[PDB]
Amino acid sequence: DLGAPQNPNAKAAGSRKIHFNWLPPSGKPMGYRVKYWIQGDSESEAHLLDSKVPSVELTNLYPYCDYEMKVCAYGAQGEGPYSSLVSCRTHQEVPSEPGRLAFNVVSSTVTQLSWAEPAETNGEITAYEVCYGLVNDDNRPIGPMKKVLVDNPKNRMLLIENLRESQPYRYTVKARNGAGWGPEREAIINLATQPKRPMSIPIIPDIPIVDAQS
Numbered sequence: 001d002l003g004a005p006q007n008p009n010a011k012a013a014g015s016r017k018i019h020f021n022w023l024p025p026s027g028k029p030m031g032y033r034v035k036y037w038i039q040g041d042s043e044s045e046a047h048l049l050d051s052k053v054p055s056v057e058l059t060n061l062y063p064y065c066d067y068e069m070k071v072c073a074y075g076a077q078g079e080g081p082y083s084s085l086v087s088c089r090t091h092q093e094v095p096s097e098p099g100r101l102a103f104n105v106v107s108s109t110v111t112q113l114s115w116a117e118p119a120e121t122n123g124e125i126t127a128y129e130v131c132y133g134l135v136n137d138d139n140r141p142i143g144p145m146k147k148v149l150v151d152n153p154k155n156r157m158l159l160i161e162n163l164r165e166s167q168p169y170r171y172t173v174k175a176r177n178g179a180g181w182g183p184e185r186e187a188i189i190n191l192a193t194q195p196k197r198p199m200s201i202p203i204i205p206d207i208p209i210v211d212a213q214s
């Protein structure tokens with residue numbers, strides 16, 4: 001009789017891969033079948049992976065995601081029983097870019113900047129960082145970018161005042177999670193060419209409003 005594979009054991013091998021191994025059972029196993037799924041899913045949603053050796057690498061997994069898996073051996077009698085179930089979480093990976101930058105332009109020197117959360121957070125987002133700087137026409141920076149420091153970096157909007165009139169700026173936003181910073185979303189805009197709309201600001205502490213010429 002083919003026994004259950006023994007000491008099933010899984011470890012994350014990145015954000016998108018898990019290595020799962022086990023000890024061969026007694027009884028002339030000819031190979032193994034691994035079933036794996038996202039913790040919470042059903043077993044018609046389970047993936048089935050064959051292997052000829054007592055380990056596999058699971059691939060094309062979701063970052064920062066709990067998986068469940070188990071493995072059986074097969075041989076002359078067919079399939080033996082499955083191992084006990086093991087769980088393992090993939091690593092976080094940096095988020096994707098934030099959503100496209102939205103500018104609500106108030107005046108020739110003031111604009112609100114906002115953005116959607118990254119389509120793939122690949123973890124929990126703990127901060128955004130906004131940078132901005134003067135550019136010419138080739139998106140060529142004129143001097144250094146500035147980075148904005150704020151009390152609550154999880155907010156997805158900023159008010160920027162005292163920008164240089166009739167001058168284009170590049171703005172970037174990136175997001176951070178436990179794995180670090182992802183790619184930036186960039187936009188280049190000159191407030192002079194934008195239609196203006198007034199906005200209301202509550203007179204309260206901690207409004208995230210930044211002076212562009214510190």
Ligand SMILES: [Cl-]
Nearest residue numbers: 014015016017
């Ligand atoms: Cl990976």
